[PDB]
Amino acid sequence: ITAYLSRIQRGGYIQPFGCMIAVDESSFRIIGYSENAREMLGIMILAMGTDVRSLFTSSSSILLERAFVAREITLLNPVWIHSKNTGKPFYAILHRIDVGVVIDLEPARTEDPALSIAGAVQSQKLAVRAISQLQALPGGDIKLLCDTVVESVRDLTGYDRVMVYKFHEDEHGEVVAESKRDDLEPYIGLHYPATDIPQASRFLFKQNRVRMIVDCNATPVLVVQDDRLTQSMCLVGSTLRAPHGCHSQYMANMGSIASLAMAVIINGSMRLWGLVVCHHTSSRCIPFPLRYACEFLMQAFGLQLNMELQLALQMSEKRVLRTQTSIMDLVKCDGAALGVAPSEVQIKDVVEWLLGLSTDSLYPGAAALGDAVCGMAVAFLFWFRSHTAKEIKWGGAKHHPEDKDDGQRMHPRSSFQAFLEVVKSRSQPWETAEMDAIHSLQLILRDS
Amino acid sequence: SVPEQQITAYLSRIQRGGYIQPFGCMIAVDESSFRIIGYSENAREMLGIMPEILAMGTDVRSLFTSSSSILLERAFVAREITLLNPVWIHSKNTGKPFYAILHRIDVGVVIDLEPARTEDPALSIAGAVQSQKLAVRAISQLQALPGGDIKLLCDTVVESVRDLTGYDRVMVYKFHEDEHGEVVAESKRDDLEPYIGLHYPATDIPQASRFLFKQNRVRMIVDCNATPVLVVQDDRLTQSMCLVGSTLRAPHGCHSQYMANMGSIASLAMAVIINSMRLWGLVVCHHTSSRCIPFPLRYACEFLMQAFGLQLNMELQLALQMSEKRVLRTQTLLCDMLLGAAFLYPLXXXXXXXXXXXXXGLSTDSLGDXXXXXXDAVCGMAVAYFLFWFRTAKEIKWGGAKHHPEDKDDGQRMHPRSSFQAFLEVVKSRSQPWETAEMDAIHSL
Numbered sequence: 001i002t003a004y005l006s007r008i009q010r011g012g013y014i015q016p017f018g019c020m021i022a023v024d025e026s027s028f029r030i031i032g033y034s035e036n037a038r039e040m041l042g043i044m045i046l047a048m049g050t051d052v053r054s055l056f057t058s059s060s061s062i063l064l065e066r067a068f069v070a071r072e073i074t075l076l077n078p079v080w081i082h083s084k085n086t087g088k089p090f091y092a093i094l095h096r097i098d099v100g101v102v103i104d105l106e107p108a109r110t111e112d113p114a115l116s117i118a119g120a121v122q123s124q125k126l127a128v129r130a131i132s133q134l135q136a137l138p139g140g141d142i143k144l145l146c147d148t149v150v151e152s153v154r155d156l157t158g159y160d161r162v163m164v165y166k167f168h169e170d171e172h173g174e175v176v177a178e179s180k181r182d183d184l185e186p187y188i189g190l191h192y193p194a195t196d197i198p199q200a201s202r203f204l205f206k207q208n209r210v211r212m213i214v215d216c217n218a219t220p221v222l223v224v225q226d227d228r229l230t231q232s233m234c235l236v237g238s239t240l241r242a243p244h245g246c247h248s249q250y251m252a253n254m255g256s257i258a259s260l261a262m263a264v265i266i267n268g269s270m271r272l273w274g275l276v277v278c279h280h281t282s283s284r285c286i287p288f289p290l291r292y293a294c295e296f297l298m299q300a301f302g303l304q305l306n307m308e309l310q311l312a313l314q315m316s317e318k319r320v321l322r323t324q325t326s327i328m329d330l331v332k333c334d335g336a337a338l339g340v341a342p343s344e345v346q347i348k349d350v351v352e353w354l355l356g357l358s359t360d361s362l363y364p365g366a367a368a369l370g371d372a373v374c375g376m377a378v379a380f381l382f383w384f385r386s387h388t389a390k391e392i393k394w395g396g397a398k399h400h401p402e403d404k405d406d407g408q409r410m411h412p413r414s415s416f417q418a419f420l421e422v423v424k425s426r427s428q429p430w431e432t433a434e435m436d437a438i439h440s441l442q443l444i445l446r447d448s
Numbered sequence: 449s450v451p452e453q454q455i456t457a458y459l460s461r462i463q464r465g466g467y468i469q470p471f472g473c474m475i476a477v478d479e480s481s482f483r484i485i486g487y488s489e490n491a492r493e494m495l496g497i498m499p500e501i502l503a504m505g506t507d508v509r510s511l512f513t514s515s516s517s518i519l520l521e522r523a524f525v526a527r528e529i530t531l532l533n534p535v536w537i538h539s540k541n542t543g544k545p546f547y548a549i550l551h552r553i554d555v556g557v558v559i560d561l562e563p564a565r566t567e568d569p570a571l572s573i574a575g576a577v578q579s580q581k582l583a584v585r586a587i588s589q590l591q592a593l594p595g596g597d598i599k600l601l602c603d604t605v606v607e608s609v610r611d612l613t614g615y616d617r618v619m620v621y622k623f624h625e626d627e628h629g630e631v632v633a634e635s636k637r638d639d640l641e642p643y644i645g646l647h648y649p650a651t652d653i654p655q656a657s658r659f660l661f662k663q664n665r666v667r668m669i670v671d672c673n674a675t676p677v678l679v680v681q682d683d684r685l686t687q688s689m690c691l692v693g694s695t696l697r698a699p700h701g702c703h704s705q706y707m708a709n710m711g712s713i714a715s716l717a718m719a720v721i722i723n724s725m726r727l728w729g730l731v732v733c734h735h736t737s738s739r740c741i742p743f744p745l746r747y748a749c750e751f752l753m754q755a756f757g758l759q760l761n762m763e764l765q766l767a768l769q770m771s772e773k774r775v776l777r778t779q780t781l782l783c784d785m786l787l788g789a790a791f792l793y794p795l796x797x798x799x800x801x802x803x804x805x806x807x808x809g810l811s812t813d814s815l816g817d818x819x820x821x822x823x824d825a826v827c828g829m830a831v832a833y834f835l836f837w838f839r840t841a842k843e844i845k846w847g848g849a850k851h852h853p854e855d856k857d858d859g860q861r862m863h864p865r866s867s868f869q870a871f872l873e874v875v876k877s878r879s880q881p882w883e884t885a886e887m888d889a890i891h892s893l
């Protein structure tokens with residue numbers, strides 16, 4: 001039913017910057033492994049049914065033995081594991097799927113433990129501090145929140161470009177705030193079609209809230225599984241999951257070799273309001289502690305943003321109902337029949353034509369008298385409403401409302417160059433609550 | 449909340465008690481030079497320094513490994529030490545692992561040493577992320593929470609802390625307007641009896657404690673009956689050291705005996721803060737047996753309590769907005785439709801004469817406190833001048849003693865109550881409280 005779903009969830013390819021080993025929870029037998037595992041572990045004795053504890057040191061062995069039995073595996077991540085052959089350190093990110101226990105081995109850049117530990121502690125500390133700074137911001141100012149959070153996230157991660165990508169009502173997105181590198185060109189203010197980010201990706205982002213991609217140009221690695229498995233494994237929770245081909249070529253064409261997307265969650269029962277994407281001109285990999293730290297920071301961001309939204313909304317409605325009982329500051333309309341509205345001529349003509357009504361695009365005759373008068377509300381009072389922003393700067397493509405997603409499509413667009421668009425002469429779409437208030441007010445005026 | 453300078457009760461002894469809990473060592477060390485200016489009595493015992501190595505005026509860095517030593521050195525010169533807690537430390541000879549919770553005081557720096565479980569170095573990395581991990585999970589339990597409800601928040605949070613730590617009882621204690629508290633939600637052990645619904649006097653928690661919980665948001669007591677440990681400090685020190693932030697700070701005797709009497713041999717209090725900040729209440733934990741939880745869990749719980757604080761603040765503001773929206777929309781509604789409560793049309797004469805004699809907008813809780821109307825159906829009322837509103841008896845359960853408005857904290861008092869037997873008090877001659885929103889709405893009519 002959902003496009004790209006099974007292809008992202010159970011796509012038998014992982015990123016080549018690390019290796020992955022899928023184990024049977026009850027028998028500790030290997031039921032899956034990526035082809036780069038043998039090379040990365042320096043095995044040059046790894047097959048289907050090989051005891052995992054034989055691949056690593058005995059301490060690591062009994063440690064992961066403790067890990068499998070545990071009520072919650074996530075609490076032991078990451079497991080610092082040494083290899084039998086090489087002796088090089090690996091971060092072990094364990095999680096559970098419907099088949100067994102998946103182990104994500106990510107090579108550790110620092111070899112001496114003290115420096116790595118100090119780095120992790122430093123990262124967590126920087127996350128706590130970033131959140132603390134994020135808490136002291138004045139309320140109501142969401143733009144300041146997003147700017148300070150892209151500056152913070154950029155300061156922590158070190159990516160050349162960091163930005164907040166807001167999902168609008170019609171599922172089309174918009175970079176609302178960014179902290180790019182100075183010499184890089186601004187992607188801020190741009191708009192993108194809804195098909196750039198499929199519903200499947202947004203759903204999986206609601207479930208999995210942090211996704212790292214080290215290199216789009218890097219050749220994906222096929223993970224071979226035991227022939228006894230009914231279907232291809234669920235590599236959603238895997239931090240090494242290779243991106244879909246279309247998004248790989250997408251990142252390739254956009255100039256983002258290394259990506260990192262985090263979810264922005266509110267509620268309406270959770271809802272994905274937007275993302276915070278990070279693009280790097282070159283390829284880079286950040287360790288697990290930094291990633292989890294960023295997930296925490298993004299959790300705080302999601303909470304605070306949710307608060308701001310709720311409070312601003314209820315306060316807005318409260319302000320409407322309070323101003324109801326200054327006439328001009330009642331609704332968002334520019335004209336009220338006084339205000340952004342012509343003389344009694346166009347009024348006479350419109351009234352002449354009128355003999356519950358509301359439109360967002362104004363009746364060709366008197367609609368060319370002014371660019372302001374485009375929205376009409378009739379119920380005896382008349383409401384004029386100004387037209388929307390007549391220019392939208394898209395990033396290579398326009399969001400077509402009747403355009404949907406299909407799993408067979410596996411090739412993106414060629415360029416994301418900013419191009420302007422003149423939307424049809426329309427006013428801002430009249431809300432339903434506004435019309436209900438118009439009815440209530442109509443009854444009120446009918447009484448007296 | 450209350451002003452800082454007005455609080456005088458228990459403060460001097462709570463801050464500088466000179467007594468710590470016996471589950472961890474405590475060493476106060478000068479900042480410039482790492483010489484010891486203070487140390488607990490049992491400090492030599494847990495570190496295996498018992499026969500000198502540890503004494504007044506000895507380099508504390510020589511009491512641990514060089515790695516732990518330079519960790520401390522970089523901790524002292526940090527921007528803010530509180531962000532480096534806990535500092536992992538190994539002993540010099542016994543090699544015993546310790547969580548070091550550091551606090552910068554007026555003169556020197558207090559170092560709390562908590563005995564940690566010997567874990568494999570391979571988990572060290574996994575150990576570094578633990579606090580934020582537990583915190584992320586617990587808060588994630590709050591993210592998937594339908595906004596609007598205030599009870600489900602406290603319930604799910606209480607349950608979250610219940611599963612996080614492992615206490616036999618976890619609950620939310622809320623401070624009312626007259627400083628007296630009430631248990632709003634709890635996750636008792638199925639065996640135990642519920643403390644839910646019953647209130648407490650304001651003198652149960654002194655102003656000093658509530659004030660102190662602002663700067664120190666987490667407090668753990670592994671055992672009240674455990675014999676406190678005297679801290680030995682230098683002779684040159686003018687006064688007792690400021691153990692206001694120590695995680696080992698022994699409870700003031702009255703609260704220890706309080707815990708003993710209530711049955712809570714193990715306590716864990718976490719303050720919740722909303723919006724110059726305000727203490728809304730605490731989240732307290734009780735255990736039938738002794739319970740010492742590691743510092744990372746207390747940190748995670750602190751995060752969870754910040755999240756809970758902000759979220760609850762949001763819920764409060766939303767609730768206010770909704771209520772105001774309701775009374776306002778009803779106001780406009782009736783105002784439009786026009787163009788028990790008495791309108792001078794009940795929905796008699798003696799009450800009118802009494803009102804004419806008393807008026808020689810008002811809000812009265814007790815008419816006896818016009819005495820004629822007292823001769824209970826018309827408990828209290830609100831007068832608008834000529835419209836009148838007549839409201840009223842709600843029962844309140846107390847857990848041992850009633851809170852009187854004459855109750856004041858006594859700094860010299862050192863003995864708590866004996867019984868917390870839940871008794872029920874009904875209230876007459878005190879009608880339904882005329883809220884600010886209600887009275888302002890009436891005045892706006």
Ligand SMILES: *[C@H](C)[C@H]1/C(=C/c2[nH]c(/C=C3N=C(/C=C4\NC(=O)C(C=C)=C4C)C(C)=C\3CCC(=O)O)c(CCC(=O)O)c2C)NC(=O)[C@@H]1C
Nearest residue numbers: 004192195196197201211243244246247261409410411412
């Ligand atoms: C294929 C023909 C179609 C397609 C498929 C597709 N896209 C994704 C995931 C993402 N797409 C994103 C789009 C942007 N990237 C940006 O930098 C910006 C703006 C500055 C946009 C709008 C983003 C973001 C994602 C998620 C990032 C991540 O790391 O996951 C996927 C899912 C792949 C996966 O494996 O998760 C797929 C299948 N996108 C297209 O544009 C065409 C139409």
Ligand SMILES: *[C@H](C)[C@H]1/C(=C/c2[nH]c(/C=C3N=C(/C=C4\NC(=O)C(C=C)=C4C)C(C)=C\3CCC(=O)O)c(CCC(=O)O)c2C)NC(=O)[C@@H]1C
Nearest residue numbers: 462648651652653657667699700702703717861862863864
């Ligand atoms: C002594 C004569 C008076 C007294 C002193 C006192 N109380 C505290 C601290 C707390 N008291 C609390 C009350 C409760 N605990 C509960 O579990 C419940 C209900 C279920 C209540 C109402 C709480 C909570 C605290 C804070 C906990 C903590 O660990 O600090 C103190 C300060 C203690 C310290 O840290 O030194 C003192 C001096 N309490 C009394 O009731 C009598 C009147």
